[PDB]
From a paper:
Under these genetic constraints, cattle have developed a unique mechanism to accomplish antibody diversity by forming the broadest distribution of CDRH3 lengths and the most frequent occurrence of cysteine residues in CDRH3 loops. Consistent with the five structures solved previously, the 7 new CDRH3 structures also showed a long “stalk” formed by 2 anti-parallel β-strands supporting a compact, globular “knob”, further establishing the stalk-knob configuration as the general structural peculiarity for the ultralong bovine CDRH3s.
The four antibodies with 6 cysteines (BOV-1, BOV-2, BOV-3, BOV-4) used three different cysteine pairing patterns; BOV-1 and BOV-2 used, while BOV-3 used and BOV-4 used pairing patterns. In contrast, in the knobs of antibodies BOV-4 and BOV-3, a two-turn α-helix and a long loop extend from the first and the second of the three antiparallel segments. These four knobs could be described as two-layered structures with the three antiparallel segments as the first layer, and the additional structural elements packed against the first layer as the second layer.
Residue numbers in the entry:
A (entry chain A): 29 to 161, 169 to 213, 216 to 269, 275 to 296
B (entry chain B): 2 to 9, 11 to 217
């Protein structure tokens, strides 16, 4: 399990800095990469740092990227300088496989000696010779660049914007007076910006019957989401808005 | 330079579908293509690497292949859980330079239609103390993913201060949506009853609250 940590909001022209840690294994033995996906766009490679300390980057973004690592604390960092609204994306920490395979071969219809006749002595050691069935030919070299992502983090949403942060107001939700066998409760996370917001119930001890909904966007720019639970007892929803450093544990009573 | 995929493909349950990934001899022609599956909410999942090798836990229903500068991901015995965004990828000029495809959204046809479950919450006492009242209509477990929401108070349609989300995929390939009626405390207590009417495939599910008894 890979965990990305960093700011949820960053201003234009600032430097976006993220860190990646692994839970369950050590990042010292693995090559660690960074992948992002802007909303409404495709996946985009950023870069990686391998076991040998070498760093490779997306060439189109190389001048704005810096990927370093710490092997004492088992941590990998990512830096994106002079961020703009195009840099708003979900950022994934990954472990990647990276290898370059070289293959040496004589050209078609050429050999390293067999059935070359007089051409074996004439072509020499460095070159291949023509087979019965030009007179000489040099070795061809084919390179296979092997790359793929082994493990994926869950991703950290980063919004770049000059707009202010508004903390949410958390309100308890419950049915009216007037019954049903399975009581349905909820929590309203009202009027916050920017995304994201996380909601758990009873400090994560309650997961069965929980349904947290995606947020609505009002014309004022503020978001609102709700999370409901169905229970066939104390219920507390844990709301966290990292952009405003707000954390509210709202008790919900029928 | 990005790899060319179709924006959307579709297949029927139990059948098979193919997703193409066209590039140049520098990326796809290099002979080491990978495939990734992105389901909303969940982390991206590696399906294929090295053109044909399956990652750990990837069933044989997912099969990768390549002919020159075009790679193909074939998914057999289609299930509702296969609905996702599929991306191909390949290194280019270097093992540290990866390029991704444009991305293909897969729709699995033939799934059973499901009516929406509707819950309508009244405003809380704390919000009412702030002279505001938000009515929350939560819509879940409907398929296909399109609903129409109508708000009503005392028999009259409410248009102002209504905001309804898009339909979003759930884990079970069903869809969810929410609608918010943002009123003041006085507007809430003025009417006799409010209603959230959710229409799905010509059928309408309605939940109502009455301010006299929601206190």
């Amino acid at each position: 399990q890979l965990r990305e940590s960093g700011p949820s909001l960053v201003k234009p022209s600032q430097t976006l800095s993220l860190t990646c840690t692994a839970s369950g294994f050590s990042l010292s033995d693995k090559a660690v990469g960074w992948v992002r996906q802007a909303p409404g766009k495709a996946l985009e490679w950023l870069g990686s740092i391998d076991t040998g300390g070498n760093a490779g980057y997306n060439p189109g973004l190389k001048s704005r990227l810096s990927i370093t690592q710490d092997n004492s604390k088992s941590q990998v960092s990512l830096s994106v300088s002079t961020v703009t609204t195009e840099d708003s994306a979900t950022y994934y920490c990954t472990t990647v496989h990276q290898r370059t395979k070289t293959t040496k071969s004589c050209p078609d219809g050429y050999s390293d000696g067999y059935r070359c006749g007089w051409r074996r002595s004439y072509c020499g050691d460095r070159n291949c010779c023509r087979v019965d069935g030009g007179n000489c030919a040099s070795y061809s070299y084919t390179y296979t660049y092997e790359w793929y992502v082994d493990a994926w983090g869950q991703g950290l949403l980063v919004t770049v914007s000059s707009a202010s942060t508004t903390a949410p107001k958390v309100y308890p939700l419950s049915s009216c007076c007037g019954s049903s066998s399975t009581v349905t409760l909820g929590c309203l996370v009202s009027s916050y910006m920017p995304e994201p917001v996380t909601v758990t119930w009873n400090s994560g001890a309650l997961k069965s019957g929980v349904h947290t909904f995606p947020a609505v966007l009002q014309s004022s720019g503020l978001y609102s989401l709700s999370s409901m639970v169905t229970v066939p007892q104390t219920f507390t929803c844990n709301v966290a808005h990292p952009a405003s450093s707000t954390k509210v544990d709202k008790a919900v009573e029928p | 330079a990005v790899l060319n995929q179709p924006s959307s493909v579709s297949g029927s349950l139990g059948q098979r579908v193919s997703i193409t990934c066209s590039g140049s001899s520098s990326n796809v022609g290099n002979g080491y293509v990978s495939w990734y599956q992105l389901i909303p909410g969940s982390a991206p999942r590696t399906l294929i690497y090295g053109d044909t090798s399956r990652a750990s836990g990837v069933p044989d229903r997912f099969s990768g292949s390549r002919s020159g500068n075009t790679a193909t991901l074939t998914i057999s015995s289609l299930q509702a859980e296969d609905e996702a965004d599929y991306f191909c990828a390949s290194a280019e000029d270097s093992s540290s330079n990866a390029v991704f495809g444009s991305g293909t959204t897969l729709t699995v046809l033939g799934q059973p239609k499901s009516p929406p479950s509707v819950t309508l919450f009244p405003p809380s006492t704390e919000e009412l103390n702030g002279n505001k009242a938000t009515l929350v209509c939560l819509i879940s477990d409907f398929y296909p993913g399109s609903v129409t929401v109508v708000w009503k108070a005392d028999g009259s349609t409410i248009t102002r201060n209504v905001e309804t989300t898009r339909a979003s995929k759930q884990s079970n390939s069903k869809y969810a949506a929410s609608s918010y009626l943002s009123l003041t405390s006085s507007d809430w207590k003025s009417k006799g009853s409010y209603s959230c009417e959710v229409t799905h495939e010509g059928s309408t599910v309605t939940k109502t609250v009455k301010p006299s008894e929601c206190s």
